């Protein structure tokens, strides 16, 4: 089916109507998304079937048709763009300066942008348009707003 | 049964709506892949 590079909605028919459960990135023939979106299940692309290849509940990532391809990193300095793909609304680039997740295992970029859960897996881009991670796994702050980790996989 | 629908190209757009703050947060990642707020 559709294998072109780009950003995709993940939809289901298992609820009322058609519901966007999340988002992902087709690159080099591999679909990348967040584990919590698909829960490891197979996907449809026209007739095309996409079968999972790699996943880790803890990283909260999953790849389909191959291994994780996306190896760019936040430089820790410059602004980035969430290419947000919200349920039933159009792909819109939002530019922001990441803040920081401080963890015992080290420091991660974080993006403080509020969207519905069905935006999980939207890609985060550097100034060269490279995917430096995915949005939609993080924390709910004092306000009630969401802060997301810039969640990137490891390329082999 | 889940399916995918293309939604756009992966490109940096000059003149994108610039917003969101930049918080420094202490967090813990659990085995289930859920982040939580340490203080
Ligand atoms: C308000 C908002 C925005 C974006 C994502 C989420 C969220 O809940 N993510 C998520 C994380 C994990 N770890 C598991 C399941 C889900 C659905 C919530």
Curated annotation (Swiss-Prot), chain A:
The active site is at residues 36, 60, 120. It is found in: Host cytoplasm; Host endoplasmic reticulum membrane. Acetylated by host KAT5. Acetylation modulates NS3 RNA-binding and unwinding activities and plays an important positive role for viral replication. It is a peripheral membrane protein. Residues 1-156 form the Peptidase S7 domain. Forms a heterodimer with NS2B. Interacts with NS4B. Interacts with unphosphorylated RNA-directed RNA polymerase NS5; this interaction stimulates RNA-directed RNA polymerase NS5 guanylyltransferase activity. Interacts with non-structural protein 2A. Interacts with host SHFL; this interaction promotes NS3 degradation via a lysosome-dependent pathway. Interacts with host CEP63; this interaction disorganizes the centrosome and inhibits host innate immune response. Displays three enzymatic activities: serine protease, NTPase and RNA helicase. NS3 serine protease, in association with NS2B, performs its autocleavage and cleaves the polyprotein at dibasic sites in the cytoplasm: C-prM, NS2A-NS2B, NS2B-NS3, NS3-NS4A, NS4A-2K and NS4B-NS5. NS3 RNA helicase binds RNA and unwinds dsRNA in the 3' to 5' direction. Leads to translation arrest when expressed ex vivo. Disrupts host centrosome organization in a CEP63-dependent manner to degrade host TBK1 and inhibits innate immune response. Inhibits the integrated stress response (ISR) in the infected cell. This is Serine protease NS3.
UniProtKB/Swiss-Prot annotation, chain B:
Residues 1-39 are cytoplasmic. It is found in: Host endoplasmic reticulum membrane. Coiled coil: none annotated. It is a multi-pass membrane protein. Residues 8-30 are annotated as: Disordered. Residues 4-39 are annotated as: Interacts with and activates NS3 protease. Required cofactor for the serine protease function of NS3. The central disordered region transitions to ordered by binding to NS3. Forms a heterodimer with serine protease NS3. May form homooligomers. Interacts with human SPCS1. Interacts with non-structural protein 2A. This is Serine protease subunit NS2B. It comes from Zika virus (ZIKV). The lineage of its organism: Viruses, Riboviria, Orthornavirae, Kitrinoviricota, Flasuviricetes. The chain holds residues 1418 to 1456 of 3419 of the full protein.
């Amino acid at each position: 089916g559709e294998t072109t590079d780009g950003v995709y909605r993940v939809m289901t028919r298992r609820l009322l109507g058609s519901t966007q459960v999340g988002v992902g990135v087709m690159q080099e023939g591999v679909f990348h998304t967040m584990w919590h979106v698909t829960k490891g299940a197979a996907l449809r692309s026209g007739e095309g079937r996409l079968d999972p290849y790699w996943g880790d509940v803890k990283q909260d990532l999953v790849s389909y048709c191959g291994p994780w391809k996306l190896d760019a990193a936040w430089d820790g300095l410059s602004e980035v763009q969430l290419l947000a793909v919200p349920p039933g609304e159009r792909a819109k680039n939002i530019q922001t300066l990441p803040g920081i997740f401080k963890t015992k295992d080290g420091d991660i970029g974080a993006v403080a942008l509020d969207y519905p859960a069905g935006t999980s897996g939207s890609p985060i881009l550097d100034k060269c348009g490279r995917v430096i991670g995915l949005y939609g796994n993080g924390v709910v702050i004092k306000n009630g707003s969401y802060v997301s980790a810039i969640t990137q996989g490891k390329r082999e | 049964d889940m399916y995918i629908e293309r939604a756009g190209d992966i490109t940096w757009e000059k003149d994108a709506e610039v917003t969101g703050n930049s918080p420094r947060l202490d967090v813990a990642l659990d085995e289930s892949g859920d982040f939580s707020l340490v203080e």
